[PDB]
Amino acid sequence: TVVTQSPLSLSVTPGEAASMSCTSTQSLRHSNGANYLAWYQHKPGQSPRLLIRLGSQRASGVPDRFSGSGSGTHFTLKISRVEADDAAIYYCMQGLNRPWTFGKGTKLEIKRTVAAPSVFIFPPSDEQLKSGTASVVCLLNNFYPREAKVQWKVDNALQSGNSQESVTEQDSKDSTYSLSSTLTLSKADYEKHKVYACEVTHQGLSSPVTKSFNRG
Amino acid sequence: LVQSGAEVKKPGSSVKVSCKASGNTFRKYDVHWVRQATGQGLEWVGWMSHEGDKTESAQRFKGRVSFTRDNSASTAYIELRGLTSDDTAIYYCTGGSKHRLRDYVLYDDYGLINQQEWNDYLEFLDVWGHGTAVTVSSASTKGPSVFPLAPTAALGCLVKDYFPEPVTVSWNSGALTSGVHTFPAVLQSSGLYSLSSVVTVPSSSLGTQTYICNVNHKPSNTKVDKKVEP
């Protein structure tokens, strides 16, 4: 018995309604008319918190903006007047049939105005270069939305498959993101080339932004 | 609740993780275990009833887990085996509310119960713990190497090739909680991790102001205060 959440991600301007949906194959309604679908929130680096139990009932501390709803196979969590504190991943969990299964989850993020990133490039330290490896890092700073593409270029050659990036969780204050991409290379192959550029592509920019440096 | 600390295990070994309750929270509540891997979500693993008469797991764990409790009633213990790198996750013990209900009954000619069936139904999981992260890997403990990132400007530190997680990076010993950005670590082909931490300051202060990142990798007793200047 599989329960599926929809949509996968949510974009809510603060102070708005946010409606989700958990849909189960078999019914979740015990013969006593109690639906056994609980809702949980999970903010990163934290323990998950129960907010809606038995379909509609609220637990201790949950404000009445979080309203559980639905019956049978169609349930729905609704967050009204969302705040930045409510951006999280919300999980519905069925409790009728064994085995008990969690839901795939629905991620909630704060909708914002488009913000372009500020780009920086960092050549490998001379400290690191004595170890035989070279690590070039490109910094993406305070942009929204999350969608962004970086293209490493070494002597005007598009690098693919040798870098590694990572984005921050959405900022509590400005509701932006930040990406760090690390192009890695050997000390020998770092020294065969001169121009290291970082071409950033984001819908906050008119044209792609390239930030380069030269060996020496 | 108070779980045990992070553990590191080679693929194919076993982990035992602890959980402790406040007073007798373990007999007013059932004991569950939920995990969450890297790209994964919340995933129920198994449970064990405070009455003590039922112990069940998720399907994937049948044959690998064993859920026991200290019969002083105080401590819960999960044991997982056949360890994959997929079994690398934060493991949460938690309480639970179950409804033990009778769904079927049949009485004989004498009025006695001839047949009956009682079933447990999960109402909610509450009072969670802090999660015991388990890392299933081949690598060994490794202190990181800290490198400077140097050119309104940006600058930071590069924490390279450490194992396992976590690593904290403070700036100016906590004086700087503005303009900083510490990123998720990435898992390398070496089996080791590399994380970056930067701060965005104006260049007019680069000559006047000091910027020292504080790096602490507790698994290998590696603490480094690295000062960053262009």
Residue numbers in the entry:
A (entry chain L): 2 to 27, 27A, 27B, 27C, 27D, 27E, 28 to 212
B (entry chain H): 4 to 52, 52A, 52B, 52C, 53 to 65, 68 to 82, 82A, 82B, ...
What sentences appear in the manuscript?
Some of the most potent bnAbs target a quaternary epitope at the apex of the surface HIV envelope (Env) trimer. In this manner, the trimer apex forms an immunogenic, structurally conserved motif consisting of an electropositive hole surrounded by N-linked glycans. Apex bnAbs discovered so far can be grouped according to their heavy chain (HC) complementarity determining region (CDR) 3 topology: (1) PG9-like with—or predicted to have—a hammerhead motif (Doria-Rose et al., 2015, Doria-Rose et al., 2014, Gorman et al., 2016, McLellan et al., 2011, Pancera et al., 2013); or (2) PGT145-like with a long, anti-parallel β-hairpin (McLellan et al., 2011, Sok et al., 2014).
Structural examination revealed that HCDR3 makes extensive intra- and inter-CDR contacts in PGT145-family Fabs. In our four Fab structures, Y32LCDR1 hydrogen bonded with the π-nitrogen of conserved H98HCDR3. We found a 52aH-D/E-X-D/Q53 motif in HCDR2 that appeared to stabilize the HCDR3 stalk. PGT143-PGT145 and PGDM1400 all contained extensive electrostatic interactions between the HCDR2 and 3, such as the interaction between R99HCDR3 with D53HCDR2 (Q53 in PGDM1403-6) and D100rHCDR3. The stalk, stabilized by tertiary and quaternary interactions with the other CDR loops, serves as a platform to insert the somewhat variable tip of the β-hairpin into the glycan-shielded trimer apex. Therefore the structural and sequence analysis reveals that the evolution of these types of antibodies is driven by somatic hypermutation in which substitutions stabilize an extended HCDR, thereby reducing the entropy for binding antigen.
